[PDB]
């Protein structure tokens, strides 16, 4: 799926909750979890647009109070082709 | 705070160890996007809606990219609808007698010269 | 009401004013039948099988309780073959 | 049939209603429908003077409340020869 | 059928919505879309009377709140042969 | 995808901005621009329903303030086959 | 006897259920467009 | 015919009255009476669109005052094939 | 697709209208109609997430005004496999 | 596990949401859905105690505002052998 | 050039003033003048991004007091490739 | 004479008056008349600069109260070559 | 045991204490310790839900006053498969 | 084009947004994303100076309200060769 939803959290516990929520809520694939540094962790899902929207809403709600919480929830429905190179393609 | 699945549903669960209009009024609402993009109805569940936390795609994201200036130019519509209330000359009457099918209570029919017909 | 077929239009330029602007049609129950004239309140084409109301009702269908009509076409039957 | 009847309406729906009415009311030939511009559609019928009169009247009443309605209903019994060059000779 | 159903709307989005509702609602065929000027667009369907009636009601509801709206919705059950000359036969 | 989204604006500048936005925001294809008449221009996109929705909301937002702005924004998830005849296939 | 929450669900109970505003027809043409009868609806909730 | 008309009434007596009226008014087939639950009874008829329209309107007018009355009277001129599977084919 | 859309209504007429609307609006397949009891009828559709979203919205708009109305519109985008046993596969 | 969790909702939509939520949240099995009558639907899950608590809480939180809502969410950790005769074994 | 600058005016005289000003101001190619309808004229220029910015400013400043004025002045630095089809290549 | 004089009027009568006036006043050539749409007609004259100034002024003065009036009377002494593609060469 | 238990602490000493506490308290298996960055360390346990719940309480109260303390203590009872790709399988 | 536009954000979600925005906004090529530690993420684009200016304004505006936001937006119009060594050459 083309769409990208991203949740950023302060800490990994919030990110895992968000991811679980996202993944459970809709048909999205977690394509990356990234430790940015400074304790920001970003979890990223790709799916069709409606799925991504539902997933991000869900994850955000979930992680808002887990740990230190949510920094950002963002959805980009079609990302520019170039932006794809900087985007993770498989979770590690 | 142990967050998790057990912090959910407070006050709605029993048997525990411790215990022992969907669609908004139409007249009021005019949807931003109509059709299958309408938001009048409250569809609960995992719908495609985006909340306050979520950012991206629409609000400043589309409205910022390209620079624009608008101008307060003079807008005067010339159309059949705009001219619906154009001032009109006094309506013609008929003084004719004899059987003429002289209906005066209907629409305005005019004849050569502008005569009521 | 009666089922009749519009044959043709009728023009009477010296009609009474009360008749209004309403169109008048020549209607017969069948071809080669007595021909009657009806105010058309539906918009009926020639060859149409149509429903024609009787006298007090005709006036009201034609447009007023005080309209000069004794026969008005009130509907076109969707399928009829006479 | 050399007489002219014209009905003008704001919109095409009222004009089709008018034409239908006219042609149904009397033996007139629809010889044109013209889009004047701005939303004005004129429908013109030609026939004998009584016929044209009847037609226009039925038509005006019919189209009056349809859509945005009637702008004008005019009957011209003898049309000058010059005016005939500007009048449509068959519908298009 | 020879019934005609016509919806006039201000703008083309309302009209496309009307046609869609109409055509989906009943067994009517879209025989045309017309730009009248001034932004009036008319969509014309044809079919039998019941079908046309259903379609016109459905279309009108659908298009009313879309765009600048509905200008007129009209049903003509039997259309005169003369009117047919000025009526579209295929969308094009 | 086979959904349709449409933005109708007053003027072309708003519409071009809208189209650009719509295509950049999501996975949609511009299939047409039409000048309705009376200064209404409709820009039409096709794609998956969610994508189309996203795109339309984005176009709406982008174009609302450009020029004389937006008249309508609409999405139709499945288009009746008849309606497709009046709908433009590829941009001209 | 206990005290129990009764929210009778029935056609009779829902007789007064809050409803959306009823459809109206802006259609013109002869269509038997009666307005004084019982509500009949067509696809999409349009008055028919 | 393939149109569907349905009358749901509160109680069976109103529904039998409606079915009678419908079947009498037009050439329609009563394909089902269903007891929905809670007292809703639904009577469903098929036929051509005009026939169905006549029938439904007639039936509605009949049952409104019989019993606890009409809940709903609806007409669908084209039924999606998928819906046919949930609709009765003959009255049992 | 595996997303599920459900509309719950008071009575069967509203629900059939909902099903028809939902099936027409989007590429969703009706999988069931259930009489819950007390007059609640639930109609359920399966399709891809966006399709489901469109369909449900449409169906609710359609059924709100028919009869006694809509009790609920819901989308479960990824539906757990356990639930599939309670859900009806093909409609009766 | 033999723990039983039960959620009663008014209508099927809330119940299905509840089932989904419960099943997604914890390792419980949906063993039944029952239509009690009067619009009540009971969804029953069996699993281990902790799992059942988690699941029921999740389910309640899910169906509370969906439809007509939740009537009851309950957990019984070990059910008597006699009450097992009245409990649905499989979700059929 | 990639960039697009579009000025929309009411009337052609303001548009010609704007084109002249744009074309004189910076190295931009005039690619179209469009009579949209309703008196709206859009003059579109293509060039490098700095040039288009200059050109639009100049054009707007020029046309503002001429005639009925400026409706919109818009700069789009890279237009999505899809939008390129609805855009003129040489003025006609 | 490369200078451009342009007069825009609401309606054609004011414009013909303007053209006549301009051409009688100065040695200017009428290169075009254009219908912009929405009732605007632009009459365009080319000539040497003083000539064009005199002509435009005469034209404005002449057309100011004829019909619905003047919108713009504008002079551009040297038009950019790019603009010349959008300007009519000979009156026709 | 498919539940997850997570504790995030500021610093490693509080985390090792938490892991030790958790494992000692209940039947949980430690699956990881991760350095998030910024000083966040997440220690994760897997087990059945009742166990995990006991273990997380234990870990939290154990590390709360050790060092810089607890940031998050969280339990997810059923973990989606997608999320399992971002979770450490075995410790070290 | 050899200008450099760089945007620094706190967190990766804002940076992906900025990258997308920049690449969408103007004709620039994304060359890299670098994690600097402490949560600073820097995204860099190369292009012509005008293009870079447009892109960078757009990107800054996009990321400012996303997440923790923008730390810096900078443009270097000619980049010295030695600097090019420390610059990422193709994205990730």
Residue numbers in the entry:
A (entry chain G1), D (entry chain B1), E (entry chain E1), F (entry chain C1), H (entry chain B2), I (entry chain F2), ...: 6 to 97
B (entry chain X2): 712 to 731, 773 to 869
C (entry chain P1): 1 to 82
G (entry chain X4): 822 to 869
Lines from the paper:
Carboxysomes are specialized microcompartments found in all cyanobacteria and certain chemoautotrophic proteobacteria, playing a crucial role in CO2 fixation and serving as a central component of bacterial CO2-concentrating mechanisms. These organelles encapsulate 2 cargo enzymes: Ribulose-1,5-bisphosphate carboxylase/oxygenase (Rubisco) and carbonic anhydrase, using a polyhedral proteinaceous shell. Self-assembly of the α-carboxysome is mediated by the intrinsically disordered protein CsoS2. CsoS2 functions as a linker protein, connecting cargo enzymes like Rubisco with the shell proteins.
For instance, heterologous expression of minimal shell protein components derived from Halothiobacillus neapolitanus, including the hexameric shell protein CsoS1A, pentameric vertex CsoS4A, and CsoS2, allowed for the construction of a T = 9 icosahedral α-carboxysome shell with a maximum diameter of 36.9 nm. To address this issue, we reanalyzed our recently reported cryo-EM density maps without applying any symmetry (C1 symmetry). Fortunately, we were still able to obtain maps for the T = 9 and T = 16 α-carboxysome shells at resolutions of 2.77 Å and 3.71 Å, respectively. The construction of structures using C1 symmetry maps yielded T = 9 shells with a diameter of 36.9 nm and T = 16 shells with a diameter of 49.2 nm, which are virtually identical to the structures obtained under I symmetry. Nevertheless, in the T = 9 C1 symmetry map, no redundant density was detected, indicating that high-symmetry processing is unlikely to greatly impact the structural building in shells with smaller diameters. In summary, we show that excessive averaging in the highly symmetrical processing of α-carboxysome shell cryo-EM data can distort local densities, potentially leading to the loss of key structural details.
